[PDB]
Curated annotation (Swiss-Prot), chain B:
Protein name in UniProt: Capsid protein
Subunit and partners: Homodimerizes, then multimerizes. Interacts with cytosol exposed regions of viral L glycoprotein present in the reticulum-to-Golgi compartment. Interacts with human FLNB. Phosphorylated form interacts with host importin alpha; this interaction depends on the exposure of the NLS, which itself depends upon genome maturation and/or phosphorylation of the capsid protein. Interacts with host NUP153.
Lineage, opening ranks: Viruses, Riboviria, Pararnavirae, Artverviricota, Revtraviricetes
Entry similarity comment: Belongs to the orthohepadnavirus core antigen family.
Residues of the full protein shown: 1 to 143 of 183
Keywords: Capsid protein, Cytoplasmic inwards viral transport, DNA-binding, Host cytoplasm, Host-virus interaction, Microtubular inwards viral transport, Phosphoprotein, Repeat, RNA-binding, T=4 icosahedral capsid protein, Viral penetration into host nucleus, Virion, Virus entry into host cell
One annotated GO molecular function: structural molecule activity
Modification(s) after translation: Phosphorylated by host SRPK1, SRPK2, and maybe protein kinase C or GAPDH. Phosphorylation is critical for pregenomic RNA packaging. Protein kinase C phosphorylation is stimulated by HBx protein and may play a role in transport of the viral genome to the nucleus at the late step during the viral replication cycle.
Main function: Self assembles to form an icosahedral capsid. Most capsids appear to be large particles with an icosahedral symmetry of T=4 and consist of 240 copies of capsid protein, though a fraction forms smaller T=3 particles consisting of 180 capsid proteins. Entering capsids are transported along microtubules to the nucleus. Phosphorylation of the capsid is thought to induce exposure of nuclear localization signal in the C-terminal portion of the capsid protein that allows binding to the nuclear pore complex via the importin (karyopherin-) alpha and beta.
Highest taxon of the lineage: Viruses
Entry GO terms, CC: host cell; host cell cytoplasm; T=4 icosahedral viral capsid
UniProtKB/Swiss-Prot annotation, chains C, D, F:
Species assigned in the record: Hepatitis B virus genotype D subtype ayw (isolate France/Tiollais/1979) (HBV-D)
Post-translational modification (record): Phosphorylated by host SRPK1, SRPK2, and maybe protein kinase C or GAPDH. Phosphorylation is critical for pregenomic RNA packaging. Protein kinase C phosphorylation is stimulated by HBx protein and may play a role in transport of the viral genome to the nucleus at the late step during the viral replication cycle.
Gene Ontology terms for molecular function: DNA binding; RNA binding; structural molecule activity
Compartments, as annotated in UniProt: Virion; Host cytoplasm
GO CC entries: host cell; host cell cytoplasm; T=4 icosahedral viral capsid
Function: Self assembles to form an icosahedral capsid. Most capsids appear to be large particles with an icosahedral symmetry of T=4 and consist of 240 copies of capsid protein, though a fraction forms smaller T=3 particles consisting of 180 capsid proteins. Entering capsids are transported along microtubules to the nucleus. Phosphorylation of the capsid is thought to induce exposure of nuclear localization signal in the C-terminal portion of the capsid protein that allows binding to the nuclear pore complex via the importin (karyopherin-) alpha and beta.
Domain of life: Viruses
UniProt keyword annotations, A-Z: Capsid protein, Cytoplasmic inwards viral transport, DNA-binding, Host cytoplasm, Host-virus interaction, Microtubular inwards viral transport, Phosphoprotein, Repeat, RNA-binding, T=4 icosahedral capsid protein, Viral penetration into host nucleus, Virion, Virus entry into host cell
Name this protein carries in UniProt: Capsid protein
GO biological process: microtubule-dependent intracellular transport of viral material towards nucleus; symbiont entry into host cell; viral penetration into host nucleus
Subunit annotation: Homodimerizes, then multimerizes. Interacts with cytosol exposed regions of viral L glycoprotein present in the reticulum-to-Golgi compartment. Interacts with human FLNB. Phosphorylated form interacts with host importin alpha; this interaction depends on the exposure of the NLS, which itself depends upon genome maturation and/or phosphorylation of the capsid protein. Interacts with host NUP153.
Protein family according to the UniProt entry: Belongs to the orthohepadnavirus core antigen family.
Impact after mutating T33N: In strain: Latvia
Disulfide cysteine pairs (residue numbers): none
Entire-sequence positions represented here: 1 to 144 of 183
Length: 150, 143, 144, 144, 150, 144
């Protein structure tokens, strides 16, 4: 139905189409981050935020895909097909869900404004050739660059 | 986590276990309804409601599953393994998405109160022995 | 009795397992830190803080546990099965007591909010790819 | 450190030596009492009291000790040594834990004043030779 | 469904797990006590008290168990099974129902506060070894210890 | 007496055990620093501060120790034993004196607050495993 899951929030896929695959933590890492930060909010009987509602659906569908992968690994005697399907799932679908979970966890930790400005700047950066761009990518952090907590 | 997708919407999987799995309309029937009734709101750049949010996400993930099925049919050399994967996908995961779509569309269309009352009444009905079970199963209506 | 030793302090084992088990200093180092900084307050006849009470009980637990381990190693004569059992004490209980001690000492030294922010930030940091995170690992310091 | 787990309040491990070791209820009985009376508070996210904090920490320590001993007696294969180590555990740690649970559950149910007066009076009683020792020993009660 | 029939009232099974089986009168005695004290309240068309509602249900279920025992005694030719089932019923289920009826009759005669304090004290007593506890158990009574009514 | 040469201020020999012994500058470097910064005050007839007093006394003690060891190594005729005794001297007394000079010169140049915060932070640092230990260790400075 030609839906963009970020348009509802202020972004698009074209804005995140720049962020490489080497930028997004693993799905297990992102799910651990969520469990640690907003678990009592994702498991709560309140909508909390549109970002919280979106996070719950993404986690559910990833769980369904993981169940699919285990079921395949168990019920497919053909190891070639088994491997190909499981690896396709992990790589591609995990990339989609990594984009998604990162976007939501970030728009929750930081704000939509900050995340969108970071995306604009990261686009400026990753579009620029290496011979003309700074080597140190732009960075989004809760900590100062000195990373000393007091 | 043990997330429940209906707890924020005032329900639980125990409250939808009342309805059987052969009751939910097919995923294609649910998507036709969703289009016809809320296309310009799901394609909208607004949080018109958590139901709309969840419906967008469900539709995107079902689309991912359909892309998976096509990619399987295209790339899987073993026809029997390819057939087993597609049928499992459809049956099981389409069942989950049937309940997910049914719930959200029905809420948007009728009301959370109405949907919960309908679940309770359908439980009454399906638990009622047949000798005293009316043939006119409960049904959601505006008129 | 479904007890969490942190939820009265605003944390959770899911939040402390969010860091690597290789991050938490050794039990000896933490006991030395305590003996150095809060000995007069742990031996004091005053409650002081819910953290002092918890820290006082964690030190006694470790003492009883080490007593058990050394006594059973003395009695048992298996030099190989020692390295497994009286070092399984170390891995499991030692990791849980390393997290408990770090949490309490660090809270008493810096602040509860500071410690929790540190936990989340360090977890996100060690989970993030290097090229898109600050190079230096997050650390706690009293020095401005 | 030389931490006395009672001097934080108004007692000492030598003021509880007035009570023999045959006086202290079993850990099962005491944990049942706790589950009965202060479960909603021990499972609470609030510093309801230092007794609650110490009780949480003690219950967790006992959980860790039981885990260790069971896992060990399982892996190790001699039941004679099994009985030996379990007797050692029971005696040494179980007594030090019955004391602690009794003290905390009492100073919670009853007051510190009442508990200390009870300890003094029971010292008087159990010191007095049996010939001149009444049969109606003292006991903690919320009744006449 | 993990229900505790006394939690609704302020107690638990762990608090009554101390009271021995030699402490509770027979079920016939407790039912006679109820019939004599609150019959016109248990047979009335008003809830009266949560304790009254609980008493009515307990009496009903005990009646069903008694009916079961008679039916068994009448319709089981096997005297071994007959005896074993009937004795199991009496002992175990009667112990449960004795705990229950005692608790309710007491929280009605006396109050919840008094009953719970008595239970705490009786626990203190029955946990203490005999060599260190008074021999005369703590006692709950409508009468003074002198038992002289004036 | 059980005199701790630091508790007169706000420290203890166990709070300086946070710093390894390989961290402390050589006595030559430290005496040069003193000559550079506080010579006019150490040669002064005024109680400019307890740090100054302790520093005078420590420098004199070192003078006496050096006199003894040199005079001895001279009179005694074995260089192997010479090296042995000088190694013992260096280790045992030189470390206990590097600690003292460092502490006093720092609490003079910088403040007691800063020195103690530095000790705590360096304890944190040198405890943190190297994998998660930043390279930019803490250091005392009058600059950013």
């Amino acid at each position: 139905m030609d839906i963009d899951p970020y348009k509802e929030f202020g972004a698009t896929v074209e804005l995140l189409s720049f962020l490489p695959s080497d930028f997004f933590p693993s799905v297990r890492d992102l799910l651990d981050t969520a469990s640690a930060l907003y678990r009592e909010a994702l498991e709560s009987p309140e909508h909390c935020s549109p970002h919280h509602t979106a996070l719950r659906q993404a986690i559910l569908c990833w769980g369904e895909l993981m169940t699919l992968a285990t079921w395949v690994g168990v019920n497919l005697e053909d190891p070639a097909s088994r491997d190909l399907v499981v690896s396709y799932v992990n790589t591609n679908m995990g990339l989609k869900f990594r984009q998604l979970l990162w976007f939501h966890i970030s728009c929750l930790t930081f704000g939509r404004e900050t995340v969108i400005e970071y995306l604009v700047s990261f686009g400026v950066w990753i579009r620029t050739p290496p011979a003309y761009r700074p080597p140190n990518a732009p960075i989004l952090s809760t900590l100062p660059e000195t990373t000393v907590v007091r």
